[PDB]
RNA sequence: AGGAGGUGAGGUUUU
RNA sequence: GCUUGAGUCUCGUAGAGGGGGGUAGAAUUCCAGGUGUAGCGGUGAAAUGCGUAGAGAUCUGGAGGAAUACCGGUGGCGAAGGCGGCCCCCUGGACGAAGACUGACGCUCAGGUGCGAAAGCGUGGGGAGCAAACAGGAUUAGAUACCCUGGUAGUCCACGCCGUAAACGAUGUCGACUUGGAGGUUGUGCCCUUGAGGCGUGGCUUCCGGAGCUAACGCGUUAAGUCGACCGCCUGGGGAGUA
């Protein structure tokens, strides 16, 4: 993420662009993952749990719009 | 005592400390500072305020070299990642480049086990 | 026979012997009764990442209909030669003679 | 197996060189494949994933030979004599 | 919103840097198919060609070097 | 090739042999044969200098070309033979002109293979050429410390030396003991490892197989008397002193190297 | 409403 | 005697399928050096530990081991176990449209044979990181644990041995039938493809649910529904999968 400032470019804009580029690249997530060791056992369980939670939440959000509460 | 204008600021941050090193472009370090050495110790050195105080102290230590334009190379997931750069900018330096050099291996070596707190 | 594609890099300082390398390789292929369907020299171009403390190298691409043994022999020759930095060979399903998208 | 080799085996063992489904043709093809893989399994001794296919071919050839022996012994004897088999 | 399906291409060549730079990012990584709308059949070939290009130094691995 | 024997009698239960069917079951080359008489550890003064040496079996010295100075002329291997004078085996090699010689047998060598010496030779096992043309990272044997003197390094049954670096006129090596050394780049070195790499798996099973090679029994110091050895003395078993060789020098960890003209060549000591 | 980054007495028994 | 089961061949498809041999990069570690000084690291807080013998920080060069960040997705392959950088050689299997051929050659299987996660054993190497055992520092009434500092066997390679797992879909194999809806992946047949479009036909796979079944949970065209063939297993909990 090589961020180079331009002529007459402010500092806050450059800092925010650098932060956004780092967040899009996703290095904090990688370093937090590599701080500990995740077993293949755990990785598969976490991935499956996240996928099923995502599918269930999207289905609930889509199907909860057909009934009112007021 | 040597005069160099184009400088580099290496930042080594972590969850417990933050070290700032002012050097030249060839790697020869000119000055350094750390939050743990800058008064704060224990849980007070993990705050970004300690990181900015260390950055200010490092700037005051390297001011003798006469550095005007500075680039920044940050490495480490720490809260001081922004505070150090803000302090460097407020210290009158000119930030000409910002880069992240955080090492992320390609699944090379096994990391240490997980903590069961 | 079996279609192969070979792309190999060479040092910029040894860019005056690329024709000799090509002549020797095609002579060996013709002696082995192979066929050449495409031959290009991309030139002394820049690299993406430095290799052995340099930034420019000259690339050569060649599509061959050579048999199996001569491909391994050419691999050994490339490995022994210090002028060539690296080489990649790939078994292609069908020979192609359309110009490379970078010869332009 | 090579298409040319399969065509040669079909021409040698079949009648019209196009049936390519007779018991003798199938047994000859399986035997040729087994004999070609003999040299492959004499070096790669840790290739059970491909040795299972060889075992399947052996079982298929044994079943075909049993069917041929039960139907027409005269053809079975000639086939085993030509292929060099023992049973 | 795929593009190779519309183009009706059969294979992918690692020498098309002009289009590999679009599918790779500034950091040098390959973007997922969910951002570009790409089909998996062509995404696998794209990754296989990008790896060979990185080996041949046509494309970089990261922005560090 | 490694075969265990049957326990038909006490003395074969733990015997393991290395049987090589590719050797020559015949007689060696008489023009290359010569006499080699045993001494028994005694020098010109007749006193024992190296202990545990004496007896054994009568042997003959098969001369072997350690220089490989027949540059340019190719040659063909004929047969492998067993050499009692060294752990490894020998290969008989006939040149195109008609000269026959004995060379050390590499790992990948058989009766009928072709070898070629000289600088112009190709990179295949058994070939000899100066290290200036040998690439980096290769494994060699019969390494020469000085050009033209003859191979001295990695002459055992299964040893090899890696070529790690080559700066100027010197080449950096990694020996079988893990030590690094600088050698003149003009020194020739045979390519590949050596043949009998399974020689270390052999065991003897009895004192007879050890005395057949000329190794006399070894007596420990504790069983001796204080006059004979410093460890002697004691009503029972007593070793209340630091281990020491019979001539006063300590052996457990004490260095015995006092050479200063080769420290320039030595880069890193073995660990 | 979607995606990404963390995140809890540090321990403290029996009836 | 027959082709509808099964099987064979011509043409292609995708796949971390298996074995062997090479190569590339990121990163950790160590070594030799250059700049430079009082701390580094770690915890809830500390300490042991590493440091003025110049550490930690930053740059260059080199040494060697292991695994291949993104892509990567309840995505793919394999009988299961299980398989992820790239290239070469050998090889197994599955599927798809057209065709050609044998004419039940079919299913299951006691015993038997083979494969068989990780850990463990022997022989010979290698050993970067992590880490049982082990030592120290902490917490605690005590802590032979949870935390931290180091670290051996091991983890890796080659040949063999053991043949055990929550080896799980807690669901034996093959076959025929019975309303559906959302997708994913991999092929093919057509229609102005008239730009990523519409229709139909196959294989595998994810989820929700109808009749029906079930003690209920739930299964539900990939059944735990409607039926046939074969094999294996259970007959109260402990003792014990032990003597
Ligand atoms: Mg830790
Ligand atoms: Mg004589
Ligand atoms: Mg003598
Ligand atoms: Mg002795
Ligand atoms: Mg002797
Ligand atoms: Mg002894
Ligand atoms: Mg006396
Ligand atoms: Mg004495
Ligand atoms: Mg007495
Ligand atoms: Mg006593
Ligand atoms: Mg005593
Ligand atoms: Mg009590
Ligand atoms: Mg594979
Ligand atoms: Mg295949
Ligand atoms: Mg059984
Ligand atoms: Mg194991
Ligand atoms: Mg072991
Ligand atoms: Mg520990
Ligand atoms: Mg303790
Ligand atoms: Mg069991
Ligand atoms: Mg499961
Ligand atoms: Mg069970
Ligand atoms: Mg069965
Ligand atoms: Mg069924
Ligand atoms: Mg499957
Ligand atoms: Mg359901
Ligand atoms: Mg039931
Ligand atoms: Mg009972
Ligand atoms: Mg028992």
From Swiss-Prot, chain B:
Membrane-crossing ranges are none
Which segments does the entry list as coiled coil?
none
Classification via InterPro entries? Ribosomal_uS11 (IPR001971), Ribosomal_uS11_bac-type (IPR019981), Ribosomal_uS11_CS (IPR018102), Ribosomal_uS11_sf (IPR036967)
GO biological process annotations for this chain's record?
cytoplasmic translation; translation
Against Pfam families, the record matches this protein to: Ribosomal_S11
Q: Which GO terms describe its cellular component?
A: cytoplasm; cytosol; cytosolic small ribosomal subunit
Q: Which UniProt keywords apply?
A: Methylation, Ribonucleoprotein, Ribosomal protein, RNA-binding, rRNA-binding
Q: Name a GO molecular-function annotation.
A: small ribosomal subunit rRNA binding
**Biological function:** Located on the platform of the 30S subunit, it bridges several disparate RNA helices of the 16S rRNA. Forms part of the Shine-Dalgarno cleft in the 70S ribosome.
Assembly mode: Part of the 30S ribosomal subunit. Interacts with proteins uS7 and bS18. Cross-links to IF-3. In stalled ribosomes contacts ribosome rescue factor SmrB.
Query: Which miscellaneous remark does the UniProt record hold?
Result: Has been predicted to contact the N-terminal domain of IF-3 based on footprint studies; exactly how IF-3 interacts with the 30S subunit is controversial.
Family per record: Belongs to the universal ribosomal protein uS11 family.
Name of this protein: Small ribosomal subunit protein uS11
Q: Which organism is it from?
A: Escherichia coli (strain K12)
From Swiss-Prot, chain C:
Q: One GO molecular function term?
A: mRNA 5'-UTR binding
Q: A GO CC term?
A: cytoplasm
A single GO BP term for this record reads: cytoplasmic translation
Its PTM note reads: 5 different forms of the protein, varying only in the number of C-terminal glutamate residues, were isolated. The sequence shown is form bS6-6, which is the longest. The first two Glu are encoded by the rpsF gene, the other Glu are added post-translationally by the RimK enzyme.
Residues bearing N6-acetyllysine are 93
What stretches pass through the bilayer?
none
What residue ranges carry the coiled-coil annotation? Answer: none
**Which key words are in the record?**
Acetylation, Ribonucleoprotein, Ribosomal protein, RNA-binding, rRNA-binding
Give the highest taxon in the source lineage: Bacteria
Entry's family note: Belongs to the bacterial ribosomal protein bS6 family.
Q: What does this protein do?
A: Binds together with bS18 to 16S ribosomal RNA.
Oligomeric form and interacting partners: Part of the 30S ribosomal subunit. Interacts weakly with uL2 in one of the 3.5 A resolved structures.
Kindly provide the name given to this protein in its UniProt entry. Answer: Small ribosomal subunit protein bS6
Q: Which gene encodes it?
A: rpsF
* Covered range of the whole protein: 1 to 104 of 135
Curated annotation (Swiss-Prot), chain D:
Task: List the GO cellular component terms.
Answer: cytoplasm; cytosol; cytosolic small ribosomal subunit
Q: Which CDD domains match?
A: Ribosomal_S15p_S13e
Specify the superkingdom.
Answer: Bacteria
Query: InterPro entries from the entry?
Result: Ribosomal_uS15 (IPR000589), Ribosomal_uS15_bac-type (IPR005290), uS15_NS1_RNA-bd_sf (IPR009068)
Keywords from UniProt, A to Z, are:
Ribonucleoprotein, Ribosomal protein, RNA-binding, rRNA-binding, Translation regulation
Q: What PROSITE patterns does the entry give?
A: RIBOSOMAL_S15
Q: What induces it?
A: Part of the metY operon that extends to pnp, also has its own promoter.
Q: Listed GO molecular functions?
A: rRNA binding; small ribosomal subunit rRNA binding; structural constituent of ribosome
Q: Which GO terms describe its biological process?
A: cytoplasmic translation; regulation of translation; ribosomal small subunit assembly; translation
UniProt family annotation:
Belongs to the universal ribosomal protein uS15 family.
Q: What does this protein do?
A: One of the primary rRNA binding proteins, it binds directly to 16S rRNA where it helps nucleate assembly of the platform of the 30S subunit by binding and bridging several RNA helices of the 16S rRNA. Binds to its own mRNA, stabilizing it 5-UTR and preventing its translation. In the E.coli 70S ribosome it has been modeled to contact the 23S rRNA of the 50S subunit forming part of bridge B4. In the two 3.5 A resolved ribosome structures there are minor differences between side-chain conformations.
Quaternary context: Part of the 30S ribosomal subunit. Forms a bridge to the 50S subunit in the 70S ribosome, contacting the 23S rRNA.
Protein name, please?
Answer: Small ribosomal subunit protein uS15
Q: What is the primary gene name for this protein?
A: rpsO
UniProtKB/Swiss-Prot annotation, chain F:
Q: Name one Pfam family in it.
A: Ribosomal_L2_C
- Which GO terms of the molecular function aspect are on file? RNA binding; rRNA binding; structural constituent of ribosome; transferase activity; zinc ion binding
Q: Name a biological process GO annotation.
A: negative regulation of DNA-templated DNA replication initiation
Locate the compositionally biased regions of type Low complexity.
Answer: 38-47
One GO CC term, this protein: cytosolic large ribosomal subunit
Q: Does this UniProt record's set of keywords contain ATP-binding?
A: no
Q: Which UniProt keywords apply?
A: Acetylation, Ribonucleoprotein, Ribosomal protein, RNA-binding, rRNA-binding
List of residues that carry N6-acetyllysine: 241
Query: Where do the segments described as Disordered lie?
Result: 27-52, 220-271
Where are the coiled-coil regions?
A: none
Classification via Gene3D superfamilies: 2.30.30.30, Nucleic acid-binding proteins (2.40.50.140), Ribosomal protein L2, domain 3 (4.10.950.10)
What is noted besides the main data?
This protein can be partially replaced in vivo by its H.marismortui (HmaL2) or human (L8, from the 60S cytoplasmic ribosome) homolog.
What this chain does, per the entry, is described as:
One of the primary rRNA binding proteins. Located near the base of the L1 stalk, it is probably also mobile. Required for association of the 30S and 50S subunits to form the 70S ribosome, for tRNA binding and peptide bond formation. It has been suggested to have peptidyltransferase activity; this is highly controversial.
User: Record's family?
Assistant: Belongs to the universal ribosomal protein uL2 family.
Record note on quaternary structure: Part of the 50S ribosomal subunit. Forms a bridge to the 30S subunit in the 70S ribosome, contacting the 16S rRNA. Interacts weakly with S6 in one of the 3.5 A resolved structures. In pull-down experiments interacts with CedA.
According to UniProt, the name of this protein is Large ribosomal subunit protein uL2
């Amino acid at each position: 993420p090589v961020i180079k400032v331009r002529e007459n470019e402010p500092f806050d804009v450059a800092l925010r662009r650098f932060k956004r580029s780092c967040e899009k690249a996703g290095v904090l997530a990688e370093v937090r993952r590599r701080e500990f060791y995740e077993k293949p056992t755990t990785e598969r369980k976490r991935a499956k749990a996240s996928a099923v939670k995502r599918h269930a939440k999207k289905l609930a959000r889509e199907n909860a719009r057909r009934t009112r509460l007021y | 005592r040597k005069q160099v204008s184009d400088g580099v600021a290496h930042i080594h941050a972590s969850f417990n400390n933050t070290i700032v090193t002012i050097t030249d472009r060839q790697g020869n370090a000119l000055g350094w500072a750390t939050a743990g050495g800058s008064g704060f110790r224990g849980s007070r050195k993990s705050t970004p305020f300690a990181a900015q105080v260390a950055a200010e102290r490092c700037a005051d230590a390297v001011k003798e070299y006469g550095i005007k334009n500075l680039e920044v190379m940050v490495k480490g997931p720490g809260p001081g990642r922004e505070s150090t750069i803000r302090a460097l900018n407020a210290a009158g330096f000119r930030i000409t480049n910002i880069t992240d050099v955080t090492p992320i291996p390609h699944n090379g070596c096994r990391p240490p086990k997980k903590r069961r707190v | 026979m079996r279609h192969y594609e070979i792309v190999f890099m060479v040092h910029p300082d040894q860019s005056e012997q690329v024709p000799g390398m090509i002549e020797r390789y095609t002579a060996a292929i013709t002696g082995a009764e192979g066929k050449i369907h495409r031959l290009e020299d991309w030139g002394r171009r820049q690299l993406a990442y430095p290799i052995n403390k340099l930034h420019k190298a000259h690339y050569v691409l060649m599509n061959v209909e050579a048999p199996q043994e001569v491909i391994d022999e050419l691999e050994t020759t490339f490995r022994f030669n210090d002028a060539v930095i690296r080489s990649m060979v790939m078994r292609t399903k069908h020979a192609v003679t359309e110009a490379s998208p970078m010869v332009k | 197996l090579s298409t040319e080799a399969t065509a040669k085996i079909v021409s040698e063992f079949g009648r019209d060189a196009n049936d390519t489904g007779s018991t003798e043709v199938q047994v000859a093809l399986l035997t040729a494949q087994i004999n070609h893989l003999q040299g492959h399994f004499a070096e790669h001794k840790k290739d059970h994933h491909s040795r299972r296919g060889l075992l399947r071919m052996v079982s298929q050839r044994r079943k075909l030979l049993d069917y041929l022996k039960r139907k027409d012994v005269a053809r079975y004897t000639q086939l085993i004599e030509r292929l060099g088999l023992r049973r | 919103f795929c593009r190779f399906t519309a183009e009706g291409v059969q294979e992918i060549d690692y020498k098309d840097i002009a289009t590999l730079k679009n599918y790779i990012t500034e950091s040098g990584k390959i973007v997922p198919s969910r951002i570009t709308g790409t089909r998996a059949k062509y995404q696998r070939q794209l990754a296989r060609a990008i790896k060979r290009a990185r080996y041949l130094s046509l494309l970089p691995y990261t922005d560090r070097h | 090739a490694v075969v265990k024997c049957k326990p038909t009698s006490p003395g074969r239960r733990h015997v393991v042999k290395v049987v090589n069917p590719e050797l020559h079951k015949g007689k060696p080359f008489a023009p290359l044969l010569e006499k080699n008489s045993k001494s028994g550890g005694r020098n010109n003064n007749g006193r024992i200098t190296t202990r545990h040496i004496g007896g054994g079996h009568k042997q003959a010295y098969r001369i072997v070309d350690f220089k490989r100075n027949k540059d340019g002329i190719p040659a063909v291997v004929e047969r492998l033979e067993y050499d009692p004078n060294r752990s490894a085996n020998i290969a008989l090699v006939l040149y195109k002109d008609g000269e026959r010689r004995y060379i050390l047998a590499p790992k990948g060598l058989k009766a009928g293979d072709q070898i070629q010496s000289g600088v112009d030779a190709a990179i295949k096992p058994g070939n000899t050429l100066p290290m200036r043309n040998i690439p980096v990272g290769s494994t060699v044997h019969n390494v020469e410390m000085k050009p033209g003197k003859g191979g001295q390094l990695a002459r055992s049954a299964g040893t090899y030396v890696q070529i790690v670096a080559r700066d100027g006129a010197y080449v950096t090596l990694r020996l079988r003991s893990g030590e690094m050394r600088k050698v003149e780049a003009d020194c020739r070195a045979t390519l590949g490892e050596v043949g009998n790499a399974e020689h270390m798996l052999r065991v003897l099973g009895k004192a007879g197989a050890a005395r057949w090679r000329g190794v006399r029994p070894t007596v420990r110091g504790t069983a001796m008397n204080p006059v004979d050895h410093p460890h002697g003395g004691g009503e029972g078993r007593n070793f209340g002193k630091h281990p020491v060789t019979p001539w006063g020098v300590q052996t457990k960890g004490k260095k015995t190297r006092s050479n200063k003209r080769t420290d320039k060549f030595i880069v890193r000591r073995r660990s």
